[PDB]
From Swiss-Prot:
Localization terms from the record: Cytoplasm
GO cellular component terms, semicolon-separated: cytoplasm
SUPFAM superfamilies in the record: HPr-like (SSF55594)
Major subcellular site: cytoplasm
Family: Belongs to the HPr family.
Protein name listed in UniProt: Phosphocarrier protein HPr
Function according to Swiss-Prot or TrEMBL: General (non sugar-specific) component of the phosphoenolpyruvate-dependent sugar phosphotransferase system (sugar PTS). This major carbohydrate active-transport system catalyzes the phosphorylation of incoming sugar substrates concomitantly with their translocation across the cell membrane. The phosphoryl group from phosphoenolpyruvate (PEP) is transferred to the phosphoryl carrier protein HPr by enzyme I. Phospho-HPr then transfers it to the PTS EIIA domain. P-Ser-HPr interacts with the catabolite control protein A (CcpA), forming a complex that binds to DNA at the catabolite response elements cre, operator sites preceding a large number of catabolite-regulated genes. Thus, P-Ser-HPr is a corepressor in carbon catabolite repression (CCR), a mechanism that allows bacteria to coordinate and optimize the utilization of available carbon sources. P-Ser-HPr also plays a role in inducer exclusion, in which it probably interacts with several non-PTS permeases and inhibits their transport activity.
Keyword ATP-binding attached: no
Residue span, HPr domain: 1-88
UniProt record, GO biological process: phosphoenolpyruvate-dependent sugar phosphotransferase system
Phosphoserine carried by residues: 45
Keywords assigned: Cytoplasm, Phosphoprotein, Phosphotransferase system, Sugar transport, Transcription, Transcription regulation, Transport
Active-site residues, record numbering mapped to chain: 14
Length: 88
């Protein structure tokens, strides 16, 4: 399962949103990867996500693989919207 979106947050994918996303992703059995530029990371890891240093305008792709992938993708998309990282 997957979705792509453009990061519209003016600070990028920074601590607050990364922390919230890592928490949310960690609930899922699925493997949840975040892809940006040439980098791929585990969305469940705040360090991994911060290390990606995703900045505004970057188009990211979230890929969920696993038994709860469909829920996971929606949960993650909503989370991004809720944290204002992306536009709903």
């Amino acid at each position: 399962a997957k979705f792509s979106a453009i990061i519209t947050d003016k600070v990028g994918l920074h601590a607050r949103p990364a922390s919230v996303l890592a928490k949310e992703a960690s609930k899922f059995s699925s493997n949840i990867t975040i892809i940006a530029n040439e980098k791929q990371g585990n969305l469940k890891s705040i360090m991994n996500v911060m290390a990606m240093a995703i900045k505004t305008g970057t188009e990211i792709t979230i890929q969920a693989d696993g038994n709860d992938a469909d829920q996971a993708i929606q949960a993650i998309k909503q989370t991004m919207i809720d944290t204002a990282l992306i536009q709903g």
